[PDB]
Amino acid sequence: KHLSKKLIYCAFRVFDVDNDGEITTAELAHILYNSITQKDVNQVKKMIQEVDKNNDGKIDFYEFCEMMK
């Protein structure tokens, strides 16, 4: 389990582009779609809402783990 934990940490760090400890809509859209559309942004917003435990519109590491485990 430790190794999957370590890789979950690394994955978050790489998605958290600006290193503030939160994945935003803009960061998540960028990872999901490497010049993308409003429709895509709204779909990302809805995804975040399914796992956003503190309702701030972002995904922190705890929320990322909860979603992964």
CB of 20 to its own copies, least distance (A): 18
Q: Is 26 in the site for its own copies (CB under 8 A)?
A: no
Q: What is the 3-state secondary structure (H, E, C) of the chain?
A: CHHHHHHHHHHHHHHCCCCCCEECHHHHHHHHHCCCCHHHHHHHHHHHHHHCCCCCCCEEHHHHHHHHC
Using CB under 8 A, pick the residue from 26, 32, 40, 57 that binds its own copies.
Answer: 32
> Is 35 or 55 the residue whose CB approaches Ca ion more closely?
55
Per CB under 5 A, residues contacting Ca ion are 16, 18, 20, 22, 52, 54, 56, 58
- Which of Ca ion, its own copies, none does residue 68 bind to, with CB < 5 to 8 Å depending on kind? its own copies
